[PDB]
Amino acid sequence: SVLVDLQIATENIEGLPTEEQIVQWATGAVQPEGNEVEMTVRIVDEAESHELNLTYRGKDRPTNVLSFPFECPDEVELPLLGDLVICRQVVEREASEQEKPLMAHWAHMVVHGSLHLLGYDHIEDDEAEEMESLETQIMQGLGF
């Protein structure tokens, strides 16, 4: 199925994300009939994520949307999105400033950092239609 990981860092905020809502709304509207994929997403302040990476591997520096891609040997035809790590203060501010439902900002902001970071658009043979339709159903299917 289409499993996604929504890991919030704050317990009390001005607009909690909750996986049920986010996942269901976005990821739920993408595979209402056929589901299959894995998208890990960690939403926490800059310091946490940055330190988190640099503490266990030494990743980049104070970025905006850092994600962790899976093993990219050659082509490997299989549904996947990999791990993701983004800040809420930024996206929440962007979405909050845009004056639009954070629901879309999430599905969009996640995919924005998912591809722009690794490019899960692997092999255009199988993963193509799957991935394409995958991102298309959540991004276009709703028309953010």
Side-chain angles (χ1 to χ4, degrees), residues 3-138:
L3 279 78
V4 59
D5 227 88
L6 219 309
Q7 228 164 125
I8 185 75
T10 48
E11 224 155 283
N12 263 252
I13 359 67
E14 255 255 43
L16 41 105
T18 64
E19 43 247 81
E20 292 101 63
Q21 246 306 81
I22 305 294
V23 181
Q24 184 165 37
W25 156 258
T27 359
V30 47
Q31 312 271 246
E33 218 165 62
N35 65 0
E36 219 152 76
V37 265
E38 203 188 299
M39 337 157 102
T40 2
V41 190
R42 207 164 293 92
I43 172 124
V44 53
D45 218 329
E46 292 162 298
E48 228 138 321
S49 308
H50 304 328
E51 232 301 299
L52 170 281
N53 342 310
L54 272 73
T55 193
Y56 97 104
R57 32 100 74 261
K59 221 142 208 264
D60 219 44
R61 253 101 156 88
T63 196
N64 177 225
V65 178
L66 175 96
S67 333
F68 297 70
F70 91 126
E71 205 153 290
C72 181
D74 267 319
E75 270 107 334
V76 282
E77 267 175 329
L78 69 154
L80 40 53
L81 241 313
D83 246 66
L84 227 84
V85 197
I86 314 108
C87 314
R88 44 140 278 286
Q89 56 145 318
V90 188
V91 318
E92 189 212 299
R93 198 89 123 82
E94 240 250 278
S96 168
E97 196 102 300
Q98 259 229 74
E99 218 85 303
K100 252 70 88 149
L102 244 180
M103 305 294 80
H105 203 77
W106 264 101
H108 235 148
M109 73 120 310
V110 296
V111 175
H112 113 64
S114 291
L115 210 149
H116 209 257
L117 169 279
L118 70 103
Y120 59 100
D121 207 30
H122 300 107
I123 344 79
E124 58 173 70
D125 298 336
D126 262 31
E127 181 70 304
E129 64 186 278
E130 280 144 54
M131 192 279 230
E132 285 174 32
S133 178
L134 190 272
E135 177 265 307
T136 293
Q137 227 136 312
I138 1 186

